[PDB]
Amino acid sequence: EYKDTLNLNTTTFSMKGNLSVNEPKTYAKWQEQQAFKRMQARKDNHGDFTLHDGPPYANGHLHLGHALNKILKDIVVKREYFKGKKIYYTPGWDCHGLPIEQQILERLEKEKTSLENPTLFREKCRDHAKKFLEIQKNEFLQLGVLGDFEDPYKTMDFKFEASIYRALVEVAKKGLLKERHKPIYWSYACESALAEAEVEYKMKKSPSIFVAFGLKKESLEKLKVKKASLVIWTTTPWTLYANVAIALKKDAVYALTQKGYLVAKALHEKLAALGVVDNEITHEFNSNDLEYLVATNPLNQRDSLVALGEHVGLEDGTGAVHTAPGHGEEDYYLGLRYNLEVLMSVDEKGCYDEGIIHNQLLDESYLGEHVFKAQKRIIEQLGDSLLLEQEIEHSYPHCWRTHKPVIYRATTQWFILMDEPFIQNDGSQKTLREVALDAIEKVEFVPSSGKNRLKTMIENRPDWCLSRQRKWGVPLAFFIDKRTNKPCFESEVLEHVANLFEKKGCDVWWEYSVKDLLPPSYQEDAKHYEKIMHILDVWFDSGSTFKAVLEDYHGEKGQSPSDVILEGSDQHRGWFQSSLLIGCVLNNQAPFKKVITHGFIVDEKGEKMSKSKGNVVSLDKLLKTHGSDVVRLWVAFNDYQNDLRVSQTFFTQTEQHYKKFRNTLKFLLANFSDMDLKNLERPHNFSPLDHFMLETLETISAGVNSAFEEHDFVKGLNILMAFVTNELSGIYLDACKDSLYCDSKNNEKRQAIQMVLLATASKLCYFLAPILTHTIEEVLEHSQALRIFLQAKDVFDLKDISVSEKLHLKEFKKPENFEAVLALRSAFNEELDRLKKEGVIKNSLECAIEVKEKALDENLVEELLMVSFVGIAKEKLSETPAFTLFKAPFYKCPRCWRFKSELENTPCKRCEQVLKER
């Protein structure tokens, strides 16, 4: 009957987020009003923070991994902004390379067409990247992320292409860029060399054969046996044509069987059990005595030299290794060590060429045949020399963009050398491997385990092949002097080319003549120079972003080294490594101080998302289903260092966390909305319960901040949520509802409660603003009191506030100790539950309690236990060692529902006064 006489305590801040409607309006506003530039221009910026963006490929729409990545970057950046620092965060895009060029190739072929003109082909590639750079930029902004998205970096900008080339120039001037001729990864489907980061290892079925190479007559006479054939094991019959040698383990015993097969003795038992060779050994020979004997290749009748390899393994195979220098790296060095032929008759498309006829290595019927299609017919040609064929499965290197298996071909390519000493900037002498290992020890990794992942790769990596045979990318734009057959690294030549690139882009490398590309002083000798037309590994491009973005803009986009880079843990094999290596040539240090990694988006069963599996969840679908602030809370509230599973159950839990945060903020705003703002300019007398809350607010704030400092948003959101749920909602807001709703608006106890709620809302806003930025922006939009209190027009004016100073607290005020009264509260609530089960009582306000520890504040007990009366009464309900509960000897007040009225249906003394209010 008196509900209309209570304090309204409502706010326009709504319970329902309606995120699908309101978030795009918030983000459109931040773009229109240039919130990021306003963040950078903030007048009281103190300190600097550079996060250097790793560039996604400008191909396709964003997937959930991009969203994960940019949200985490956004939280880290916003944290530093709200700490008061000046922010540098320029997002960028990877525009070159097969990731763009392959999509153009697949379209041309689907359209049944070709495009041979180099300038036009690069134009199609460039326009494709421009289209999807726009698409990804606006998709990034729909996640609520703030960065220099209107002035991002692009590896396709002419200045950027000049920067990438100038980095290459520094490598070449330091003596680390050299030509090598050796077998390397060859992708026949795109007719290009590859390096490790462009290769994906996948299980693949393969023939597996054991082949007998008979010793030649004179070798049998030297060995003093009638029959002997070395048995090799190989999974690549397509390289048998290129055999020049059979490599044995140094100083090892080889067993000759009765049928005349020669194998490593340590492997004879296994081989006989496989049925490869017979079981009876007749003679044992040391491999040192077999070296320089000669066998015969059964496929083509050619000589094969018996050699000793370095580190021949005896765990698989036969202990005798078919050695093909044109198709294996260790084979190649063995062939050179013995001055043997390098047979390599497989062309760029992976097919046998005329060289099989010229040297008589393989029958003419194989001309033009792809090496992988030829293998079945090769195996049949082996006849009786084939001792056993099996089919096995092994992890095999595949091209990262055509998805086809690679092969190896001896070829001349350009490398960054790992174990080549070079002159350091401080004058000393060190290899790149040594510098990179030193540099890693100075980088902070989050998690720490990332260090040894990257360190192990550096310890084991080979020389870095740089040259690729595609068209879309930055050329290795050096001339070869025909008079010397060596590259021209003259500073005048290199910088002249770099300047042309900066002004017109690398197109001119294909269009201009040699004379036109040479300085005026060299054009009389243009006849002696020839362009290198290979382009750079795209991992060199992105490995150069630190130079093109941080250094070449002299701090305007961040410092080099950056404070933080943040990408998936798959970038130890990619961007972390290439940036580390180039940083170490140019600066002899890593171009980052700290690396934070995250895992991958996976499905509900932790499995990888793929179109073949039909388990891909699109970014659009997820945002539309849940809203970006929920997707952002999902990220921060979960162990993002590992894989994150998408499932209804986990998003339901996050929506429940978001609702609790949002409902709590609504209650706070609603219950200080009527507070006279003059309270903000005067101190108050806070109760012990108020002090307990402010002292608690401080304690958990320190813990949320320490957790967020170490990027452990889970630990920090759990602290924050536990405070919201337990101390705030469960204790304080329950004890306070009566005063808030039923006391006079002039009541100073109520005004002191509102000040605590205002300080609490202020801390919630500060700590959630990096994560739920839209929502905290919406909180300030709906609360004039919060905006005045925090002196904030919008979310970007937020600062960490001193509650002690804003509420005028005395410094040496001793903290509350509520342990004794909270144990009583817990024991009373356990006893009250039992009485409620029995039906004796319905709620705590129906009770009186006499506490047996008389040293406790009686009004605090009434407040925390929500009893209507502290002391003795007449009707005993139950008793414990700690207290005795009674029925409260009053009527329920019709206005406040507390059992404090002396007459039935009559307002209590407090309520009567409030109702008389003049």
Ligand X SMILES: C/C(=C\C(=O)OCCCCCCCCC(=O)O)C[C@@H]1OC[C@H](C[C@@H]2O[C@H]2[C@@H](C)[C@H](C)O)[C@@H](O)[C@H]1O
Residue 622 or residue 896: which is nearer to Zn ion going by CB? 896
Residue with the two structure tokens 């919630």: 764
Residue 291 or residue 570: which is nearer to ligand X going by CB? 570
Minimal distance, residue 146 CB to ligand X, in Å: 18
Beta strands 601-602 and 644-645, pairing class:
parallel
Q: What CA dihedral angle connects 374, 379, 385 and 389, to 10 degrees?
A: 140
Percent helix, strand, coil in the chain, to 5, is 45, 20, 35
Residue 63 or residue 691: which is nearer to ligand X going by CB? 63
Which of the residues 835 through 894 are near Zn ion (CB under 5 A)?
893
Residue 154 or residue 750: which is nearer to ligand X going by CB? 154
The window from 378-386, 472-480, 567-575, 697-705 that contacts ligand X (CB under 6 A) reads 567-575
Report how far residue 438's alpha carbon sits from residue 434's, in angstroms, rounded to the nearest whole number.
6
Number of residues that bind ligand X (CB under 6 A): 24
The window from 58-66, 232-240, 301-309, 716-724 that contacts ligand X (CB under 6 A) reads 58-66
893 binds, among Zn ion, ligand X, none (CB under 5 to 8 A by kind): Zn ion
Residue in 199, 223, 616, 822 binding ligand X, rule: CB under 6 A = 616
Q: If binding is defined by CB under 5 A, does position 908 make contact with Zn ion?
A: yes
Minimal distance, residue 124 CB to ligand X, in Å: 22
Residue 564 or residue 896: which is nearer to Zn ion going by CB? 896
Residue 94 or residue 816: which is nearer to ligand X going by CB? 94
Q: If binding is defined by CB under 6 A, does position 196 make contact with ligand X?
A: no
Minimal distance, residue 82 CB to ligand X, in Å: 24
CB proximity list for 475: less than 8 A, separation 6 or greater: 506, 509, 510, 531, 532, 533, 534, 535, 536
Instruction: Answer yes or no: are the C-beta atoms of 355 and 367 closer than 8 Å.
Output: no
237 binds, among Zn ion, ligand X, none (CB under 5 to 8 A by kind): none
What's the token pair of residue 785? 């009191």
Residue 679 or residue 868: which is nearer to Zn ion going by CB? 868
The window from 62-70, 223-231, 480-488, 866-874 that contacts ligand X (CB under 6 A) reads 62-70
Q: If binding is defined by CB under 5 A, does position 740 make contact with Zn ion?
A: no
The torsion region of residue 351 among left (phi > 0), alpha (psi -120 to 50) and beta comes to: beta
386 binds, among Zn ion, ligand X, none (CB under 5 to 8 A by kind): none
Sign of CA dihedral 801, 807, 809, 814: negative
Q: If binding is defined by CB under 5 A, does position 911 make contact with Zn ion?
A: yes
Residue 76 or residue 769: which is nearer to ligand X going by CB? 76
CA angle 133, 139, 140 (to 5 degrees): 90
Full DSSP string of 351-399:
BB-THHHHTT-S-GGGTT-BTTTSHHHHHHHTGGGEEEEEEEEEEEEEE
Helix (H) or strand (E) holding 45: none
Minimal distance, residue 71 CB to ligand X, in Å: 11
Instruction: Answer yes or no: are the C-beta atoms of 740 and 675 closer than 8 Å.
Output: no
What's the token pair of residue 276? 């490869």
Q: If binding is defined by CB under 6 A, does position 568 make contact with ligand X?
A: yes
Q: If binding is defined by CB under 6 A, does position 63 make contact with ligand X?
A: yes
Residue in 600, 650, 891, 897 binding ligand X, rule: CB under 6 A = 600
Q: If binding is defined by CB under 6 A, does position 571 make contact with ligand X?
A: yes
Residue with the two structure tokens 């091209």: 399
Residue 56 or residue 487: which is nearer to ligand X going by CB? 56
What's the token pair of residue 573? 């094999």
Cβ-closest residue to ligand X? 65
Q: If binding is defined by CB under 6 A, does position 361 make contact with ligand X?
A: no
Which of the residues 280 through 309 are near ligand X (CB under 6 A)?
none
The window from 44-52, 56-64, 156-164, 239-247 that contacts ligand X (CB under 6 A) reads 56-64
The window from 140-148, 348-356, 389-397, 607-615 that contacts ligand X (CB under 6 A) reads 607-615
C-alpha distances (whole Å) from 636 to each of 55, 89, 367, 845 are 22, 20, 59, 40
Phi first, then psi: give them for residue 886, nearest 5 degrees: -125, 165
Phi first, then psi: give them for residue 606, nearest 5 degrees: 70, 5
Residue in 567, 690, 727, 777 binding ligand X, rule: CB under 6 A = 567
What's the token pair of residue 188? 């026949």
Helix (H) or strand (E) holding 641: none
791 binds, among ligand X, Zn ion, none (CB under 5 to 8 A by kind): none
Q: If binding is defined by CB under 6 A, does position 542 make contact with ligand X?
A: yes
Q: If binding is defined by CB under 5 A, does position 896 make contact with Zn ion?
A: yes
C-alpha distances (whole Å) from 913 to each of 685, 824, 895, 908, 917 are 22, 32, 12, 9, 6
Q: By the criterion CB under 5 A, which residues form the site for Zn ion? A: 893, 895-896, 908, 911
Q: By the criterion CB under 6 A, which residues form the site for ligand X? A: 54-57, 63-66, 68-69, 94, 542, 567-568, 570-571, 574-575, 600-601, 609-611, 616
